[PDB]
């Protein structure tokens, strides 16, 4: 036994879905990919890494690319720091950045007469 989850892009985009059977082998279910989260059916597994869209678990995410695919999530761009013992990097220019931060302050004040 186990849970059944439906993986979907918005219905504003597509009516295609993939189904995850949680904690079960793909051999017991009756684009079939076995994950640590369970058996994922309807998504095409690829060897490319992308930013996570819809999380599946254990590093696996799914996205709509058209059909639904499954992949190992990327943690970000790979970069090598110019590490040295006699060289320093110094900015010759700058930019002024403005970013937004949003915080909740209060709730609606409800009252229920028991």
């Amino acid at each position: 036994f186990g849970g059944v989850s439906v993986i979907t892009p918005g219905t504003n985009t597509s009516n295609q879905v993939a189904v995850l059977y949680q904690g079960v082998n793909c051999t017991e279910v009756p684009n079939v990919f076995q994950t640590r989260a369970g058996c994922l059916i309807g998504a095409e597994h690829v060897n490319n890494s992308y930013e996570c869209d819809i999380p599946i678990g254990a590093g696996i995410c799914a996205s709509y690319q058209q059909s639904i695919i499954a992949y190992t999530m990327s943690l970000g761009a790979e970069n090598s720091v110019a590490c040295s013992n006699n060289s320093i990097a110094i900015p010759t220019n700058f930019t002024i950045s403005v970013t937004t931060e949003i915080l909740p302050v209060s709730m609606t004040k409800t009252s229920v007469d028991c």
Binding site: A82, N85, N86, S87, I88, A89, I90, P91, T92, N93, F94, T95, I96, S97, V98, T99, T100, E101, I102, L103, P104, V105, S106, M107, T108, T110, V112, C114
Partner: protein, 211 residues
């Protein structure tokens, strides 16, 4: 302004609070439709059919279920209220430290070096616009921990020693602005036998050409 007007998820944090509270009330009201083992979910239908002793048995079942439903609601509200209070406390701290002053706390008032912030009101919340300074267009320079001159070790007072391949300069650290190395922008401590990586260069004394 253009980002917010074209990004449906921009204010998800405030919308989530509204959605959770609406959902909780809808759940509480829908529980009034449950029988909880009674012949009916409607008290008037029970009272119009049964006499006192029989009605009391059915009513007790509804009271038990409805009381439990209400207790569940209140407990969840207390837990959510604590979360919102923590958020409000953080917002109040940011108002003081980001808006009413300039912060040195990394990533507290936006990404980059904080300059200033501006508050904007929002439904059940606050929006902060953080203005930061972000370094750009860096260049590679050769550096040294100290300059050796007249047998003495000279260190930067404020900046860092750099070389463009032929000449040594001292510059502020966050913006390339090379200046001649002089006795007015360095200080001397000890001889040249201690510092690892110390290099030879002239250190200019402004009084020299005057006298």
């Amino acid at each position: 302004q253009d980002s917010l007007s074209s990004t449906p998820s921009a204010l998800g944090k405030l919308q989530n609070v509204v959605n959770q509270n609406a959902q909780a009330l809808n759940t509480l009201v829908k529980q009034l439709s449950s029988n909880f083992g009674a012949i009916s979910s409607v008290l008037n239908d029970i009272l119009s059919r049964l006499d006192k002793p029989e009605a009391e048995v059915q009513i007790d079942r509804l009271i038990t279920g409805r009381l439990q439903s209400l207790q569940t609601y209140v407990t969840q509200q207390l837990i959510r209220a604590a979360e919102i209070r923590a958020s409000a406390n953080l917002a109040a701290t940011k108002m003081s430290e980001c808006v009413l002053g300039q912060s040195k706390r990394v990533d507290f008032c936006g990404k980059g070096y904080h300059l200033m912030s501006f508050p904007q009101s929002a439904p059940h919340g606050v929006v902060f616009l953080h203005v930061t300074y972000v370094p750009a267009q860096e260049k590679n320079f050769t550096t040294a921990p100290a300059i050796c001159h007249d047998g003495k070790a000279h260190f930067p007072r404020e900046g860092v020693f750099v070389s463009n391949g032929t000449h040594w300069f001292v510059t502020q650290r966050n913006f390339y602005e090379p200046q001649i190395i002089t006795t007015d922008n360095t200080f001397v401590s000890g001889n040249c036998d201690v510092v690892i990586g110390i290099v030879n260069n002239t250190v200019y004394d402004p009084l020299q050409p005057e006298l």
